[PDB]
Design a binder for this molecule. Structure first.
Ligand SMILES: NC(=O)C1=CN([C@@H]2O[C@H](COP(=O)(O)OP(=O)(O)OC[C@H]3O[C@@H](n4cnc5c(N)ncnc54)[C@H](OP(=O)(O)O)[C@@H]3O)[C@@H](O)[C@H]2O)[C@@H](O)[C@@H](O)C1
Ligand SMILES: NC(=O)C1=CN([C@@H]2O[C@H](COP(=O)(O)OP(=O)(O)OC[C@H]3O[C@@H](n4cnc5c(N)ncnc54)[C@H](OP(=O)(O)O)[C@@H]3O)[C@@H](O)[C@H]2O)[C@@H](O)[C@@H](O)C1
Ligand SMILES: [Mn+2]
Ligand SMILES: [Mn+2]
Lengths: 403, 403
């Protein structure tokens, strides 16, 4: 028998789940600081009034708050480094995020730069970011505390250590972070998430699926992630299209937010693999391409590559994904059983109108070697976590079949 | 639709799983202190040589080690308070446990008393222990760090905050603890666990089952515990009897240790209910009664009481336990579907020869009001977590049907 061996690492988590739990953001932030920077996008939290509420709760708590409403989707290094300067100029001591993955990741990055800076700065968030064998600057407990109120049922970021930051100079979009950048408190407010439009629901829903299906097939044993990852796929199958079709379907919103929370916990314990490794350089080189659509448009060729070069242990995992996707009934450890996950994936992608080749999003064949070097330089952990090897041209071939 | 609302709290966890992972106990302890007290039972870790190994690894690391090999099953306050005096006399700075729940709980208690003491003591572990409305002494970060190497696939204690300590004066056996008594590092070594005798395997295996089945039916929503709790019951059904019948069945040992780890994580997030509340006063008043046999001997009347006074939401949960116990195929939310969990429980109890009335263990009817007051005074959280109310005589009646 093959001995099972793993190390499970999961930072402390504190999750406040329910509708109206934004009311708690002030009291919880005060436990961690007296002067918050509130990190949000530019318009949607404002428009739907949750921004005003959050400011009200923080200040009614008695947390002085500087609003940084500058985060655009796929946050950049300049937006993070500028946010940290505001932290250092105003003497903020806790970073609060209200927004999707882009805001929560910018928030964690601001926490990192600002906690490790001198008085004015002398460091960039890129110093923490993987870049080939470049020795990264260690992320330490100096990282400012982060409070995360998520507004998407998508990235898991309210319960992960990771920030995903794009350098516009190199187009890298790596992820980085550890126990010191994991949010001290995570607020999941159904009243915010139920305002996601249909298409944002579907994109971020597919991100939930992408995490847990990759977490399950990552190389090695990771049993503590697996029941959460499986339950998440089962909730995606049962509830994501319900949420896309009726945003006011509260049970469907709750299950997607539970599933999104499973995915963050699962992505912390396990890790993503080749699908994320190649999806990030897509948003790096094409910053208006959603992360969840980049994932969707390359999923079928990658899943088919992993099954074809896999083994019995990997196939069994893909077979369990197929059962959870309702594309199959019995779990088995064969190439054929694993292939039904490809059938289930295509149905999911079709039900959510995510099945689009990379050409339809604006990606051009000329950018293949650029993105391929992007995946290995900035997402090397994902390539190494993939259940099968991929060479540099393995990845270029995958990109082209996704075209 | 019924809105879902919960708060999830899970302290940082670091789990080293595999065979031969006792080799890591020294390096990991050194990260937390230079002078450990090693908290073990009296004979079995010594006899099987893991005690010598642990001392060797700790000192070969360079951790000076004082052995406290005095823990008897169902640890008492005097054994904890005496262990803390040795900590304070020798200036130990990290508490290391190698043993079952009894050693890990004694270790956490030693960490608490010794971290909150003056120079010689002036405090008992009982000061931290629930006792009716007695204001308990707060358990703070002063708690010494705890390294836990478990030797049973039973209590979950290597990944819970809780210590269960008996006061011989009152016979109370409450549990207590929080984030500051959760082990900094948890080592799960298949080579130690595979030495559990058959009967200890079955007893501690049923403890694994008791945690997750109670965690699933505890009042309120607790979605982050549930997939782990379900997977644990599925592993108990598939592998516990294999482990009892062949202790060298390594796959069965691994799955039980994974299941035991699920149960600790799940018992931290959720909580136990009436079965544990009444099982503890049994070991409190009868200290040679195993915790897992006390649980077993009262399980059928309690599960039948919770189903009979339950609702659709509770019944659905018991129905999922029945499916996971292989006693049923479809999940439904009816009294009848939930009742098949009682059929599945009896099969499990019969396959492990745990089906014994309280009379067969030595419990006498005269002790019912004593144990009943024990459950409410010392295990009030479990009674309140139970999905249905129980009055003081509800509990006395349950005890008598278990006789
Ligand atoms: N830290 C982590 O663990 C991970 C984070 N990731 C990264 O997360 C980012 C994507 O985040 P998402 O949450 O999907 O969406 P964004 O934060 O970019 O916002 C996109 C648009 O949606 C809007 N939005 C968010 N919640 C809304 C709501 N309730 N109602 C209406 N609109 C809402 C946003 O409005 P704003 O522009 O005002 O911010 C934005 O326009 C990407 O940059 C991705 O790379 C992923 O890579 C992920 O796998 C891992
Ligand atoms: N802190 C927590 O979260 C919980 C701990 N609990 C508490 O845990 C204690 C029971 O622990 P267990 O692990 O089941 O067993 P014990 O620690 O008492 O040891 C019992 C006997 O088994 C022996 N043993 C343990 N591992 C062995 C091994 N690999 N091979 C051979 N023998 C082994 C032990 O040998 P020693 O006497 O030398 O210690 C002991 O005699 C009870 O006191 C229980 O109340 C439970 O209440 C539980 O629900 C919650
Ligand atoms: Mn993602
Ligand atoms: Mn127990």
């Amino acid at each position: 028998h093959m001995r099972m061996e793993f190390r499970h690492n999961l930072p402390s988590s504190d999750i406040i789940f329910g509708s109206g739990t934004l009311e708690k953001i002030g009291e919880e932030t005060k436990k961690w600081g007296d002067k918050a920077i509130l990190v949000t996008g530019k318009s949607n939290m404002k428009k739907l009034g949750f921004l005003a509420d959050a400011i009200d709760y923080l200040e009614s708590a008695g947390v002085e708050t500087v609003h940084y409403g500058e985060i655009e989707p796929n946050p950049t290094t300049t937006v993070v480094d500028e946010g940290a300067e505001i932290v250092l100029e105003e003497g903020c001591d806790v970073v609060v995020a209200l927004g999707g993955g882009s805001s929560m990741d910018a928030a964690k990055g601001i926490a990192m730069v600002a906690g490790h800076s001198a008085e004015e700065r002398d460091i960039s968030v890129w110093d923490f970011a993987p870049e080939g064998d470049k020795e990264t600057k260690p992320i330490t407990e100096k990282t400012l505390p982060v409070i995360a109120a998520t507004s998407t049922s998508g990235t898991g970021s309210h319960v992960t250590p990771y920030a995903v930051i794009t350098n516009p100079e190199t187009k890298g979009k790596p992820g980085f972070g550890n126990k010191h950048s994991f949010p001290k408190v995570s607020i999941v407010d159904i009243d915010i998430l139920k305002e996601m439009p249909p298409r944002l629901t579907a994109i971020t829903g597919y991100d939930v699926f992408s995490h847990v299906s990759e977490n399950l097939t990552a190389k090695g044993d990771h049993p503590t992630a697996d029941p959460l990852a499986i339950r998440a796929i089962e909730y995606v199958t049962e509830y994501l299209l319900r949420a896309v079709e009726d945003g006011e379907d509260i049970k469907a919103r709750e299950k997607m937010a539970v599933a999104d929370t499973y995915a963050g916990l699962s992505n912390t314990i396990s890790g993503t693999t080749l699908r994320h490794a190649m999806a990030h350089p897509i948003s790096g080189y094409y910053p208006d391409i959603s992360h969840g659509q980049a994932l969707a448009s390359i999923s079928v060729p990658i899943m088919e590559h992993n099954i074809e070069n896999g083994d019995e242990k990997t196939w069994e995992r893909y077979s369990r994904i197929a059962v959870a996707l309702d594309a199959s009934k019995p779990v088995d450890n064969t190439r054929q059983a694993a292939s039904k996950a490809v059938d289930g994936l295509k149905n999911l992608l079709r039900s959510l109108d995510l099945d689009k080749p990379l050409s339809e999003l604006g990606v051009e064949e000329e950018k293949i070697p650029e993105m391929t070097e992007g995946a290995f330089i900035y997402m090397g952990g994902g390539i190494e976590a993939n259940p099968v090897d991929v060479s540099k041209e393995d990845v270029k071939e995958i990109f082209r079949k996704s075209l």
